[PDB]
Amino acid sequence: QYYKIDTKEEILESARTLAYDMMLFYKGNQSGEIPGILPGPPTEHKGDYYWWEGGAMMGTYVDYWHLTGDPSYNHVIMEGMLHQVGPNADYQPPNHTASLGNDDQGFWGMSAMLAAENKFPNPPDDKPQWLALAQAVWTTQASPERHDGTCNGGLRWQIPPTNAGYNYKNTIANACFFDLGARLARYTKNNTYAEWAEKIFDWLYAVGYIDHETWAVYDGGHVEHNCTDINRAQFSYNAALLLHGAAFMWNYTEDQKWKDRVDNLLTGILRDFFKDGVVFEIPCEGRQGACTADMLTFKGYVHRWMAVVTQIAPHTKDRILPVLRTSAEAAVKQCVGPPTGRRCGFYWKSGKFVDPSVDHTSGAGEAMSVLAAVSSLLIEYAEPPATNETGISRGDPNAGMRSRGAAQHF
Ligand SMILES: OC[C@H]1O[C@H](O)[C@@H](O)[C@@H](O)[C@@H]1O
Ligand SMILES: [Ca+2]
Numbered sequence: 001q002y003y004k005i006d007t008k009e010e011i012l013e014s015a016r017t018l019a020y021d022m023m024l025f026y027k028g029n030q031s032g033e034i035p036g037i038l039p040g041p042p043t044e045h046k047g048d049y050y051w052w053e054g055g056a057m058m059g060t061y062v063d064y065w066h067l068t069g070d071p072s073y074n075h076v077i078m079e080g081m082l083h084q085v086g087p088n089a090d091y092q093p094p095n096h097t098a099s100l101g102n103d104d105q106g107f108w109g110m111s112a113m114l115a116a117e118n119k120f121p122n123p124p125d126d127k128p129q130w131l132a133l134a135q136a137v138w139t140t141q142a143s144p145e146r147h148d149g150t151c152n153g154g155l156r157w158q159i160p161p162t163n164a165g166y167n168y169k170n171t172i173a174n175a176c177f178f179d180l181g182a183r184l185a186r187y188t189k190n191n192t193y194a195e196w197a198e199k200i201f202d203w204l205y206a207v208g209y210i211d212h213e214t215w216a217v218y219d220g221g222h223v224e225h226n227c228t229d230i231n232r233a234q235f236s237y238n239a240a241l242l243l244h245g246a247a248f249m250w251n252y253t254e255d256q257k258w259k260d261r262v263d264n265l266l267t268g269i270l271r272d273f274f275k276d277g278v279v280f281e282i283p284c285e286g287r288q289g290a291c292t293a294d295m296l297t298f299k300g301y302v303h304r305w306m307a308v309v310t311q312i313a314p315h316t317k318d319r320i321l322p323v324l325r326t327s328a329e330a331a332v333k334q335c336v337g338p339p340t341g342r343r344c345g346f347y348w349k350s351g352k353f354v355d356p357s358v359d360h361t362s363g364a365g366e367a368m369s370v371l372a373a374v375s376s377l378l379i380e381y382a383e384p385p386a387t388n389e390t391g392i393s394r395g396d397p398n399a400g401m402r403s404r405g406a407a408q409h410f
């Protein structure tokens with residue numbers, strides 16, 4: 001094994017080297033390149049990765065600085081986050097319409113929310129501020145044309161009605177909107193965010209994407225079947241994101257129903273995704289060559305989001321932290337690949353390095369996931385998410401409401 005994680009100082013050093021190796025994939029700060037994106041998209045044969053994964057990377061580094069105190073990459077991350085905001089400061093840049101799902105926009109909004117929660121340095125005064133960007137994403141996702149009567153509500157996966165997949169009302173789109181609403185409620189103390197989060201969670205429960213008996217979290221269903229054709233694939237990020245949002249709602253509301261939802265979602269996650277203490281991407285990891293570029297990132301979110309749950313729902317700490325520890329130990333045990341002696345693969349539970357080429361990418365998602373898992377071992381030393389009591393960001397009461405906003409020509 002190359003990386004050591006047995007003391008705070010060892011973890012910090014390992015995380016620093018992991019942050020270096022992940023950054024080698026990113027070219028957006030170099031002359032002639034586009035800030036905020038990993039190489040791609042694959043539809044243009046420019047690389048393996050889609051736009052939303054750039055937003056996931058940005059948030060990973062906002063958390064990296066929060067967890068380690070190392071600000072080395074903060075300027076690069078601010079540049080990337082600001083470049084992708086779009087003309088209406090809502091994470092809907094039109095050049096990316098083909099990638100404009102509610103999930104894709106949501107991941108960028110969640111990185112902005114994280115920047116506000118983590119007191120990440122503010123953009124210049126003339127540029128959109130982190131809380132305002134999160135508010136803009138949430139507001140566009142709450143807009144009435146995104147909430148029709150099919151399946152008695154819920155967001156569709158896609159934003160443009162002509163995009164393939166507009167007929168799929170899926171967990172991830174709704175989970176992003178739910179999580180943002182819960183987090184905006186806690187930060188701002190505005191109850192309209194919370195009422196929307198409650199409504200969307202109740203919809204996810206009613207439609208049966210949350211199993212009423214087992215608290216498994218399924219993938220979605222299609223409007224032409226009234227959402228009854230449930231795709232029962234269980235992706236780790238879906239259950240983990242609902243757990244994260246539920247923990248914010250428990251912290252904000254102190255309503256026992258939210259504590260019960262945290263506990264039930266957590267029981268399900270530990271049962272389904274942790275195998276002898278190691279996170280496992282059940283729909284695809286059982287054999288090599290099946291996980292997509294997107295899926296290689298999910299286990300990193302699981303680690304980072306579950307670590308935050310222990311801060312805002314502290315009664316969960318002893319159920320979560322020991323399991324994140326065994327999972328991160330498995331992550332580092334397999335970061336031994338050539339040519340560096342420390343290259344990271346995906347198949348942590350297996351105990352062996354597998355070249356990312358088996359899954360047809362250069363390996364950025366695997367690197368991101370290990371960075372997330374190792375950094376998050378420092379959660380016990382980190383501050384909890386800030387609210388507006390101590391945060392430094394600024395909001396915008398008209399976030400998402402510009403006259404040139406896309407909702408005005410839907
Ligand atoms: O990567 C898994 C992910 O794939 C697509 O985005 C959709 O099918 C989602 O519903 C699913 O969660
Ligand atoms: Ca998309």
Ligand SMILES: [Ca+2]
Pocket residue numbers: 042047048360361362
């Ligand atoms: Ca490829």
